[PDB]
Symmetry: C3
Subunit: 334 residues, 3 copies
Amino acid sequence: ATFVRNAWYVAALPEELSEKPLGRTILDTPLALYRQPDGVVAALLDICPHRFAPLSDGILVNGHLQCPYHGLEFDGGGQCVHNPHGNGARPASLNVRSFPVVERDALIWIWPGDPALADPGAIPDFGCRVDPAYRTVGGYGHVDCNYKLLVDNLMDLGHAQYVHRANAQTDAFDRLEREVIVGDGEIQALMKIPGGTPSVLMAKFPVDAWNDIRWNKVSAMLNFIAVAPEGTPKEQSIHSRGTHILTPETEASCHYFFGSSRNFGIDDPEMDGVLRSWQAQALVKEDKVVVEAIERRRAYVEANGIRPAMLSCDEAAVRVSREIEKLEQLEAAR
Amino acid sequence: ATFVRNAWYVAALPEELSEKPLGRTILDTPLALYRQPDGVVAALLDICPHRFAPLSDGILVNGHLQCPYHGLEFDGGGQCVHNPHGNGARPASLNVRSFPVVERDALIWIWPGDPALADPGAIPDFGCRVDPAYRTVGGYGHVDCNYKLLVDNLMDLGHAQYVHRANAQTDAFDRLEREVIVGDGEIQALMKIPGGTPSVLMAKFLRGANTPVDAWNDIRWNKVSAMLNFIAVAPEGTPKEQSIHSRGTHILTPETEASCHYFFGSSRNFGIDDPEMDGVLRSWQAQALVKEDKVVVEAIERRRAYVEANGIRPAMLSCDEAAVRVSREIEKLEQLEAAR
Amino acid sequence: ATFVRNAWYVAALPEELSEKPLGRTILDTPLALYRQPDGVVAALLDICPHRFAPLSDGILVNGHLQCPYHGLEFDGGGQCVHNPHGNGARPASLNVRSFPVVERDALIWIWPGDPALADPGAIPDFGCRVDPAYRTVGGYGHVDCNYKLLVDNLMDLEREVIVGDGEIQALMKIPGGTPSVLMAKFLPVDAWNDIRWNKVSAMLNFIAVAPEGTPKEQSIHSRGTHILTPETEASCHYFFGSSRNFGIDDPEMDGVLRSWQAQALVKEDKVVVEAIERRRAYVEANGIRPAMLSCDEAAVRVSREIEKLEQLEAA
Ligand SMILES: O=C(O)c1c(Cl)ccc(Cl)c1O
Ligand SMILES: O=C(O)c1c(Cl)ccc(Cl)c1O
Ligand code: FES
Ligand code: FES
Ligand code: FES
Ligand SMILES: [Fe+3]
Ligand SMILES: [Fe+3]
């Protein structure tokens, strides 16, 4: 596996974590994630230094994660704080790796690379997720594809015309206007779908519609899905700001953190349902089926030297793909 | 995986196909197989040229297969016939590979190699499957073995005496007469079982008659892995040409190096309008082929790792000539093609 | 795979075997295990010499195992004794490998390695299992981990470790002891909890209680059979049991002592060891080594003796 290890990744949603550890692998590194009694999240290598047991299968004793096998206890910095055996000696060899963690924007960010290099200032901005003016619903899915396939999926939101046709079809697709903005470690794909009638989902939300997506390295995206009367200014539109963040698990699997942060109907539980239903149907079923299928075709494509043929809808995805490749090969030396 | 690509293989039974595509892998090549609205079967590489989505998950739009991801449309020759995006241009890079198909003898034959070389004259003769004088029943099985193991299985039909003993055991097995005939592209293993009580199955062929019979179990192989047997039984001394018989379709197609597709059938000249005989034959196929032979050859496949790691080679018996000759011919074909 | 092949391993409990063969893989070697009409167990390579079918899917014909595929028949020595085909000649090429096998102490021992070196005198002493002074029960389980992890766990659980050649004993006596819950009712006590390891992965423990001053030989006690046999690199067979001198006629006690979770491996510990196996790749890729604790003294000694045996065999 080539991964970009010197980057922050979402390892969990905060609501996933408790005093009961969660075991999750990121970039082929198994983690034990838990919240301490003072509310601070810890991320330890999920391999007890004694005999390699899953720390994530243990419990907290006085706020310290206890290995379920022979009961070594660790603090959130990975220091061994109790050895119930023999003289109770705690040599430095009993300490476990602890990863840099930042809880921000209702996300748990972890740095799996060179710890000397982990700068929290580099975490991308998902502030809408903790803005009182926005209502945020979402969750987690696991996907049996390489993460870059789901980056591709998201950076060309045109696929929704077909993959998600029951919800997302529109006749104005004819008249799609595209636009890509490239910035420093950030790329945006803009689509405008003018004048058309609303898709099934937008009608639940003659109109203009905007589906924009912003990528920041490595694989963190925030989209902007908006619909409004024809003629209505984009900035006056009701919108969902969509969290779509990917984290590699293995070379051929990933973690998908998704969310809708909406500026409309924010006390409306029927709207909560519309959006959770979309997430359930579109993201965790329909897209999964596509990208998992493509993953299965990788061996053939690679064995036969097949390269993708690009269409007019592919600029932003291609630019993002090249940026990740650039980061991946940069790190591979050294 | 080494396969012989310049050869016809059965990809499907016609009854498996419709306007809803079937995704099936042959010789490590994923295919989308469907019958167009005009009735003609198409076989496309199951990898969209754009971003590699399974066309087999798509549906027909105007009788063209539509990619389910971003909606490119293809015809049965693989030519992109609509691009929904931008100026809608369709350069040659958007065409997908199409595979030659011949629908013949109630089989779907496909050429997985160089399509310029696909010669319908080379398709083996299974005409009995479409001869109104024969009644044909059969179906499909998937097996977790290298196809060559089932070729071995079939080219020694003597295995039926043990593997299928409840149905096939004969008390005249020890009087078996064998011949092997070697032709151009073709090998036959002939077995006559003279003078025995009919097997449980043969007695059913004969509507219970339990007096002594002669029986024949012959098999013809054509390259690469298409076999047709002759299972026949008659009152002792009656000519073989006068017998009631089933001509058995036994055709294998590699899927991966360690798995294959098994297309089987019986084309019989007796009890032609008889649904209970249909059931006897389908039952045999379900028990003998899809269960009992599966169990043997899948177990053998699981032992391949050990055999190879330990330098173990098979020990041949008098029953093996035809199977060995076939194996050596498939080996020859593989080697010819490995150039390059 | 790195196994120590030159040693006796348990392949089955006698009660598992009959004239219907059992197919079981030990040290990545597929075996057909069965009893002949005279009761004597044979252990054949589960690969027919003809075309490699599972002999273990066959039946006896006149006391000889018949291949299910084309009917070759073998004796317990692996000699082909009938060929149905043609002239029926039986060249030596048709013989199947037969493994040294000894039924002793209500265990079926097999030697998977160089057969020249198999000496039945070297088979570990589990005589308590057939001593009528003891009530013996047990059973079988499978675990998806490397057998060494289970040997480690067993060799853990006035202290004393005795290291000799292909045997290690870990002794513990607890004066002022506590009876186990199991033994408490058959009684100011001494307690004992000892374990004996013999190469490669065969263990016998000694769990005991008596009034202080009593010879441990005269205590209330159980001798526990705990024998691991590698299946693949990442999986193992675990033969467990106990030979006890208390409650010998109590069938309820027989039942709890036949329990895999009660006697060999509770679910929570199986979860742990199977999880450890899943971490092996990471540990190996990152050159991570275990950090030992005071409880590891015996396990480490055993571990080092196993590693020595492996190295010897890397011929
Ligand atoms: O997953 C999203 O961000 C999304 C939502 Cl919540 C609603 C509508 C559309 Cl078209 C989306 O793409
Ligand atoms: O599968 C066959 O070709 C077959 C049938 Cl249908 C009936 C009887 C025998 Cl012995 C066969 O081998
Ligand atoms: S493996 Fe964690 S304390 Fe032993
Ligand atoms: S993958 Fe087929 S149109 Fe995009
Ligand atoms: S495989 Fe055993 S007799 Fe043929
Ligand atoms: Fe989607
Ligand atoms: Fe058969």
